[PDB]
mmCIF file of C-alpha atoms and ligand atoms in Angstrom:
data_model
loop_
_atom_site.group_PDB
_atom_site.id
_atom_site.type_symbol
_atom_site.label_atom_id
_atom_site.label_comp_id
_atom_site.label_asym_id
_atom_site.label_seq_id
_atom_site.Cartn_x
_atom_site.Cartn_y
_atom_site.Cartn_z
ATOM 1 C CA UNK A 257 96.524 112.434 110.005
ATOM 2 C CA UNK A 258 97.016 109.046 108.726
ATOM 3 C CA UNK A 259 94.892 106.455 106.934
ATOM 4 C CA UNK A 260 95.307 103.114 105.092
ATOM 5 C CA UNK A 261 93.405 100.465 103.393
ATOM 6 C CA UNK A 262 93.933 97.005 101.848
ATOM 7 C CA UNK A 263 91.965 93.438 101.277
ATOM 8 C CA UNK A 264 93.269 89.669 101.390
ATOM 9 C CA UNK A 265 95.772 89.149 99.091
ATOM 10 C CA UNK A 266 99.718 88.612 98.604
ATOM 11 C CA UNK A 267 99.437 90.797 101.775
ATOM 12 C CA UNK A 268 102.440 89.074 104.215
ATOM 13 C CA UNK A 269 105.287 90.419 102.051
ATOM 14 C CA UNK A 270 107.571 93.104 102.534
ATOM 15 C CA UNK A 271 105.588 95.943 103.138
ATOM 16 C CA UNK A 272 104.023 95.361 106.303
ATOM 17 C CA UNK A 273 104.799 93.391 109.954
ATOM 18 C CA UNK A 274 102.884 90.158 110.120
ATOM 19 C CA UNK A 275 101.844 89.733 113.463
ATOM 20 C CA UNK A 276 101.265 85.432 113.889
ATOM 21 C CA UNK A 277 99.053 84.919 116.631
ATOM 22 C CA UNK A 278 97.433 87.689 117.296
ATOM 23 C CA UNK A 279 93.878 88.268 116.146
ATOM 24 C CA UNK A 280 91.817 91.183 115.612
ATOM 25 C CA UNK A 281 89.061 91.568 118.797
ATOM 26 C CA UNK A 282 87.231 93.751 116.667
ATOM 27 C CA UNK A 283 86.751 92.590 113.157
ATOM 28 C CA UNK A 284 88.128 89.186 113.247
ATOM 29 C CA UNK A 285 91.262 89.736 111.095
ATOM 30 C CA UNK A 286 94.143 87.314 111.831
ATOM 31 C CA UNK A 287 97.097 87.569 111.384
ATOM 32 C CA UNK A 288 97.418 90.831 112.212
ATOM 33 C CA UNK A 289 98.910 92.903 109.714
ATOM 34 C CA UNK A 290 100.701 96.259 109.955
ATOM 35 C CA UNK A 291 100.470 98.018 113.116
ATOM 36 C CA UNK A 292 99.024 95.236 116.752
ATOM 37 C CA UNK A 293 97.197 98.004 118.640
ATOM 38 C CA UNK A 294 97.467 96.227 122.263
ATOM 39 C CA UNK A 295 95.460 97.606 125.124
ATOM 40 C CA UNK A 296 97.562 98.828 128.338
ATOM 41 C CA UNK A 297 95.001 98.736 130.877
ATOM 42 C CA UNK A 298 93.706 95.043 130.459
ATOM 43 C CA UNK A 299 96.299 92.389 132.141
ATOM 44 C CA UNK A 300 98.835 90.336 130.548
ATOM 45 C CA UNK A 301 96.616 87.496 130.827
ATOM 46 C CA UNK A 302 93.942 89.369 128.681
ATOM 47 C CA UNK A 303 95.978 91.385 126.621
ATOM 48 C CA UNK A 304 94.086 92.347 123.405
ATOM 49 C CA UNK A 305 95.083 93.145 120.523
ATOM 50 C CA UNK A 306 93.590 95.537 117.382
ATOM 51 C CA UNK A 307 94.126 95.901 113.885
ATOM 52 C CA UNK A 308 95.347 99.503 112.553
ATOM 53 C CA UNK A 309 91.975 99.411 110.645
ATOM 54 C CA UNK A 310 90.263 98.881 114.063
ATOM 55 C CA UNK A 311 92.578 100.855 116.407
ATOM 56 C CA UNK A 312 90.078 103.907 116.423
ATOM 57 C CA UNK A 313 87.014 101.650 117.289
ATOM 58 C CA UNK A 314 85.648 100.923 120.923
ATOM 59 C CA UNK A 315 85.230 97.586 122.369
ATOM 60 C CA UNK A 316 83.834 96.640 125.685
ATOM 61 C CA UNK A 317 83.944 93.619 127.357
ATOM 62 C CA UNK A 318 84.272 91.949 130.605
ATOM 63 C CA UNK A 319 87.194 93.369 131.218
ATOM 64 C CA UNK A 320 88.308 95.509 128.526
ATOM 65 C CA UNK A 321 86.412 98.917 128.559
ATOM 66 C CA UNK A 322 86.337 102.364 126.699
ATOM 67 C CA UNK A 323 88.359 103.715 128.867
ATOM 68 C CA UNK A 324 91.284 101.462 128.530
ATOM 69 C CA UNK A 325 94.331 102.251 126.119
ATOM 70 C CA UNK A 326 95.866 100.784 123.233
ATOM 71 C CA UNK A 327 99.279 100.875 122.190
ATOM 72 C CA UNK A 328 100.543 100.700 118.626
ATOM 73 C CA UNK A 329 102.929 98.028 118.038
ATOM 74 C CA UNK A 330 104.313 98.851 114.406
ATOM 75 C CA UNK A 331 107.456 95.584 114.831
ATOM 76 C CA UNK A 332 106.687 92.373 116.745
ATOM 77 C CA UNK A 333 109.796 92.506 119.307
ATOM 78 C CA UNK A 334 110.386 88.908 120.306
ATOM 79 C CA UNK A 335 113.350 86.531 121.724
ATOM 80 C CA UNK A 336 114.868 86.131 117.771
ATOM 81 C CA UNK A 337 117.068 83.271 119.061
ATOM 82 C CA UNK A 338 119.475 81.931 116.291
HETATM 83 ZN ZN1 ZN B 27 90.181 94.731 113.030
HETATM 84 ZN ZN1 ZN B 28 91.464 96.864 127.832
#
């Protein structure tokens, strides 16, 4: 059981992982705050990506389907160099 809200303000701070880039295919929210639910089934080409707040929804498209999977990316894991 787990369940959060919040709206648009002083929201990329510490409290959260601010995903740059990545935009919500369901609601439209960008950057993605908190947890990047990224589908496993579509390719890395068409990777997409939903908010925590839209991670329980269902979105069809072209490719993507109901049937895919999402996985919840809490930390954005990247090259870091420096
Ligand atoms: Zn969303
Ligand atoms: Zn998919």
């Amino acid at each position: 059981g787990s369940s959060g809200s919040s709206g648009q303000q002083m929201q990329a701070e510490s409290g959260f992982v601010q995903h740059v880039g990545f935009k919500c295919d369901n609601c439209g929210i960008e950057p993605i705050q908190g947890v990047r639910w990224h589908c496993q089934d579509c390719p890395p080409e068409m990777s997409l990506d939903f908010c925590d707040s839209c991670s329980d929804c269902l979105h069809e498209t072209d490719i993507h389907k109901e049937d895919h999977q999402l996985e919840p990316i809490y930390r954005s894991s990247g090259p870091s160099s420096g």
